[PDB]
């Protein structure tokens, strides 16, 4: 609050042939008589100095938060949306990818590395590995020196079983009870590659509920109703029921020839 303002710095007036700006008092220094206190002056105060009452944090409606997580979960089950986001899923057996629960008993990272190779989730892990590099700006001077891509997300039913997966670079770990939208939609883009443990997959119907059955953990929460039942509007536009009420096609005028048409009617 006192930066740029820790001087006496009175203005000189008009009788002297200098601009009317506060000037540093005294003599015997190179700073004496120098312009002070202004955003234009060197060593002066910045325009509208920054304060700590700036609104750093936001309130989001609880239903809008749950709506967003549900939308990011639906998008993770569409292979074309996962591919569009950048993930390499050209060898994984199925989307959504669900594996057995035995991976929580792994003790060595070698076991976890072999499992990621078997379900063909190593292509997205390798993509993150090749993407490691130094950050491309001042952020590397800050504590943000390295950048990398995202890779697959492994969702476990509880806190256990992560010991063999913590050190694998390019693999994120999640909990079905607490699913983060910042990790389901990194960068704001839906379509994250998610690997589901089996017990986490069977918990999804009781955590987020159904269109008719309320969620067990989210009090009174049901999945939102669609604005469109079919959502395939092209199929409707090309349906025989629509086509049979469409206005008949008409023969159009012949395209003008390469010769200019008469204009002088006299």
């Amino acid at each position: 609050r006192l930066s740029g303002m820790n001087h006496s710095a009175h203005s000189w007036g008009t009788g002297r042939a200098v601009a009317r700006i506060p000037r540093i008092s005294g003599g015997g220094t190179s700073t004496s008589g120098a312009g002070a206190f202004g955003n234009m002056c060197r060593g002066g105060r910045m325009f509208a100095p920054t304060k700590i009452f700036r609104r750093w944090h936001r309130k989001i409606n609880l239903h809008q938060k749950r709506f967003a997580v549900v939308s990011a979960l639906a998008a993770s089950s569409v292979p074309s949306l996962v591919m569009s986001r950048g993930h390499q899923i050209g060898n994984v057996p199925e989307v959504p990818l669900v594996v057995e629960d035995s991976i929580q008993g792994y003790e060595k990272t070698k076991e976890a590395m072999a499992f990621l190779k078997a379900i063909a989730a190593i292509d997205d892990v390798n993509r993150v590995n090749d993407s490691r590099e130094i950050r491309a700006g001042r952020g590397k001077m800050r504590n943000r020196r390295y950048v990398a891509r995202r890779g697959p997300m492994l969702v476990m039913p509880n806190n256990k079983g992560t010991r063999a997966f913590r050190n694998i670079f390019g693999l994120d770990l999640a909990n079905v009870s607490a699913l983060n939208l910042l990790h389901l939609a990194p960068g704001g883009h839906v379509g994250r590659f998610v690997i589901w443990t089996q017990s986490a997959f069977e918990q999804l119907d009781k955590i987020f509920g159904t269109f008719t059955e309320a969620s067990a953990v989210k009090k009174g929460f049901t999945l939102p109703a669609p604005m469109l039942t079919n959502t395939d509007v092209t199929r409707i536009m090309q349906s025989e029921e629509v086509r049979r009420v469409l206005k008949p096609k008409k023969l159009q005028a012949k395209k003008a020839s390469r010769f200019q048409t008469p204009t002088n009617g006299m």
Binding site: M141, R142, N143, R145
Partner: protein, 121 residues
Amino acid sequence: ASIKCGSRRKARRAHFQAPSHVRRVLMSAPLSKELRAKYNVRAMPVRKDDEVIVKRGTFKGREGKVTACYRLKWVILIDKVNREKANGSTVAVGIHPSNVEITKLKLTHHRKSILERKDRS
């Protein structure tokens, strides 16, 4: 000696403002393959009268004996690693300890205790 942390500025301040005894550990060199098998220790801090071989840089492959561990210039001096000045006099060139590898250890009673407590078996 536990310099790396989440803050780069704090980590670089701890390294370049390290005391002399901290710089001894920071200026460590790997043992040879025969010394690793015998002592079950991957690396030891270099000291004077140790025999090393350069493994990185211009003098790569040059064997010699450590004649000084400066710790202020962050380098070690090897008797056989040297060059001539303009007037023809010979001066020692400082090599970073992590660029060399220890082939023979100078064993004292307290040095032998460091090897025993660092044994991995």
